[PDB]
Write the structure tokens for this entry.
Amino acid sequence: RIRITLTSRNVKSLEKVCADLIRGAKEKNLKVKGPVRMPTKTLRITTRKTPCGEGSKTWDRFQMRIHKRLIDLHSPSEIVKQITSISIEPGVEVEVTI
Amino acid sequence: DIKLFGKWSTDDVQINDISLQDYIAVKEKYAKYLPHSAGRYAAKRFRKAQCPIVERLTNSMMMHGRNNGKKLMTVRIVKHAFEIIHLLTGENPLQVLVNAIINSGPREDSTRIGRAGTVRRQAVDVSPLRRVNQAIWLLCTGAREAAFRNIKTIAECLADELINAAKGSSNSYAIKKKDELERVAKSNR
Amino acid sequence: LNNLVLFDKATYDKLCKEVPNYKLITPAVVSERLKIRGSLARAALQELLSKGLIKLVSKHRAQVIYTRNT
Amino acid sequence: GRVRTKTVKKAARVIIEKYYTRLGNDFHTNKRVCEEIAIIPSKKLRNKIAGYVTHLMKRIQRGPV
Amino acid sequence: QISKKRKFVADGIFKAELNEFLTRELAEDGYSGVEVRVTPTRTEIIILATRTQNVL
Amino acid sequence: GHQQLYWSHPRKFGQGSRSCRVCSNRHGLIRKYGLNMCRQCFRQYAKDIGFIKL
Amino acid sequence: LVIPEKFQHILRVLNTNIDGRRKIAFAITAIKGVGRRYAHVVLRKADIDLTKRAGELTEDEVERVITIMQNPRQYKIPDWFLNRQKDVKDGKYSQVLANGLDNKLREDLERLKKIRAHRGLRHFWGLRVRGQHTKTTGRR
Amino acid sequence: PGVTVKDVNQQEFVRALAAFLKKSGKLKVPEWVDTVKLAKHKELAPYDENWFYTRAASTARHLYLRGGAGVGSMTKIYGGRQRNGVMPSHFSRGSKSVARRVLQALEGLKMVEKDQDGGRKLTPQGQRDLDRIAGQVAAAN
Amino acid sequence: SVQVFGRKKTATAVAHCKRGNGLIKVNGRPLEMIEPRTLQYKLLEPVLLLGKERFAGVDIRVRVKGGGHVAQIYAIRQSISKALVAYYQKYVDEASKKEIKDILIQYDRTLLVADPRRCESKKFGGPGARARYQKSYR
RNA sequence: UUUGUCUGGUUAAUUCCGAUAACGAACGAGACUCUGGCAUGCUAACUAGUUACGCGACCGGUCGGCGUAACUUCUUAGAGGGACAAGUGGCGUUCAGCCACCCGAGAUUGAGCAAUAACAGGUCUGUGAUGCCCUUAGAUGUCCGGGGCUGCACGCGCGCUACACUGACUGGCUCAGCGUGUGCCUACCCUACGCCGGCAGGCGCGGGUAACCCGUUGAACCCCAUUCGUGAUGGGGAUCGGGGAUUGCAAUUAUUCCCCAUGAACGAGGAAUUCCCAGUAAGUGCGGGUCAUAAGCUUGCGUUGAUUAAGUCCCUGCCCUUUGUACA
Ligand SMILES: [Zn+2]
């Protein structure tokens, strides 16, 4: 019961590496339960635009999304080293616990 | 057999005017159980006319800012006021609302001209949907201002206001202001 | 407004001999013509339903409605 | 206001000069025609191009434009 | 330990201070930007420059 | 000076206990998520952290 | 519900005209040192039903209101209700009523005016006392 | 038919359970039930002096519907709106003294036990004592 | 057996409708036990409109969440009507579905068709979406 | 230097049609990104749920009550689909389009972005961005301590709370949603549950770096009964006294909170004027900010949810065309 946990700020690299990891685990046919899409946390900081406070008080709205996914599989726990060597694309980082 | 509030037949009441026949929506398609519809009706020109007349009546009682947004309070007020109509007069109350709105829309009115602040007014006549909603506004004034400071509560005052426009007594602020803002259009001619 | 706090001696024949001949009996009905408080209206017009000459038509926390029993 | 701008009624006409043997009077056929015959970025331009070639084929077969 | 949000923010502050310091030293080098790539054998930092001979 | 009264004031729990992590100012800070920058240094490096207007 | 022969149109108890036409716990609010939160536990401990008007009560229960009202600590009005819980001069636990709250008030005011502490000087000069801005507000 | 709390009108049932929690005489009444305010936002003591039995009645009904609750969730149920004078109004929590004393007094007549998770729940006996009262309001119309 | 939702707002109602001897229960309480009673006819509007014979084979259990009270009522009646029409299309013949849909749609279209209106966001410079602050000139 | 860029029609728009010494274009508008509205069609899952079961508890029903096997309706969120003035009737130099109505989730959802080029607009108090002038050791650096920005014969503006009976006060009942959560620098956190108090709180075992614990976020208004009865009254809770607790090195010029007491104008506001067109105004609460303590402000979230307009250049600004100049 080893669960690999993926996190990024963009959806497309995370979707490519999750598709590649389930393709590498469906080619060897371990039991893989599919990607479980955890809800996105928006970090929003709403600051004022003007550096001295003189104008017509227009406000500025920043945000950043965190996309949080996982794959869970039942296997021997040293077979699991060979799948996480194809997943080294930037953005997405991998946290593994048992 | 769609009955209003469970108890009111809509099959029998008499619109005695031609001009408001498509502009007081009370008859068989617009028979609904409740004065709440939660509608999308004021999203186009002339979809607000074929909102039911009872639904416009309970929404126009939401008017001042202490009572803004509160609909079921006026559903309760119009429920007890209709029961006050059935107990004080004992006729079908939908004829009382129809008679109040048909009788109290002012048929002639005045417009301001004179280039924005020298007063010479000109008389023209009123469109029937403007007559219907002007009648509901002159019926919801009166009753709130005549139950603002009184020992009388609102439901007797509103049902008596619809009675007092249904028979045309000149204590009725709908009928009193109807005669006044048509007689000044008589005067500026 | 100068209202009665409790009933006077010749108020009971007014309460019993005018009021069931009225068309609509609410707690806002008697106090205009009697100069009484509305607490007398609610308590006394509730007590007449045990005398059985009125019928309760509606009950609410703000508005109570009674009438003649024919 | 729903007026079509320069690209959705010039590009629709240069789509109509060639490829007239594929186009027709129904909107849902021409909407599916427009991706073999062009390279358009995203679909709201493509639905607007398809709406003008349907309106132009509604116009054109009864006289000269 | 530390949150996911505070980890992402603090790594963003690492990108900001690394690019600001590398601009403030390396005017002569043709410095345009930096590239981080992190594997746990060795954490790799790749500098973009047009002239390497002043980078060394 | 004396090292028993010089900077003896508590620099816990203060507006002088926190400052911008870039430009040494203490006013109009953004304290959330461990940024601790003032608002101007947020707006310079905003897309460099990844906070993007959308 | 008809007026009794023992109905009172006024009371003048503790030299304030209590109107006989009002309800009892709202008739007693003219005495400074009883408000309503004192009043409803006064008529709780004096064992009177609350429903009656001011004239409907006899004099014996009314004097039980006043006699239990003057020393409430004998009859388990509890200790956190009290008006002066520690006096400056006496140090007793007391609930001070109509004419004694006034005398203790102006003595504490004049004690503040004697000893050159801040608050009575702010009281004497015409200012707000408890730290308020009087730049824009409070103009007479 | 079979009559539980969830099938019946909830304006009479809490007052009939309050009539049972008066008429049994096995609910303890502590010494300060007649001088208290019931949170920091209310103005006055109750009109009816039977508020303790009514409050215990509704409290056992709330343990009928959702158990796994404690005092700190009983104050989240029993909060209200604070008028603050010239400031805006606020939501301010209910009192933990009344909920602690009501829930221990309902444990005193063997009607109420704690949960496995540390908060509270009903007994089978306290389940029985409420479904019978729902069965007895069920005939009164 | 169907379960089919209805929504007005962030209030969401879904009725669980399977075969039986007649039932309506909204979160374990029946339809005559919901708190707002000036709006009592809105939940009863398929019961008054279709008649109790049209419900004569089903056990409908409604579970609601979210929103306010009135939006919850308007999701209850829509979920009930969609429950009966989804049962009628799967298990009864479609002319009965045609009869029930013209008797339900022509009265009120919120009984079968949802509400696309949601609350529009506040923007700066004013306390609501459209309203703006008081803007003294002098 | 001009025409291209206009008499006119049309458009939210120099958006287009049309006229035509102009023909084809570029920036801005539009397109585009993000969000909202649809899916029994796909992918689906003990940090998410439905339901057929198995058992427990209560008089077939109820159980957020305890654990298992199939599904993806409800939760999450990706890949594509979808609405285009496309279908019809009318108006229309039969051309731009405009209006009406079905089928439809939807027939102007909202924000970001933002051209040529200019103002002596604001900011040297965001800057280890700064040019020069200044001071530079009886300092205008720098620290520690009391004081100050809070003062009031007085104006002007943003706001809050109300002037009550659609109300007030007391009990009951039942529902959200955006999000926050143990920290390089550095002490500063969300709080379950049990015991003790009428409160702020005191005390202890727990959980949590988060769809897991607070949290089914048991929110307010709204709803249902009690009392009050037009009174400056039980509305108004301003000002003003004694006491208890919390934070902190320290609360006086009361920081905050609660107990009791006190009951000021105010009864709906005159000339001028501010804001607004559908989930809109408004009523009502809840999160974020600042924060050792914390919101009458600001930034968002939802909830209850309307009257009135579907237009004009009268007013106020602004752009454009023709016209006058000794103004640049
Ligand atoms: Zn910043």
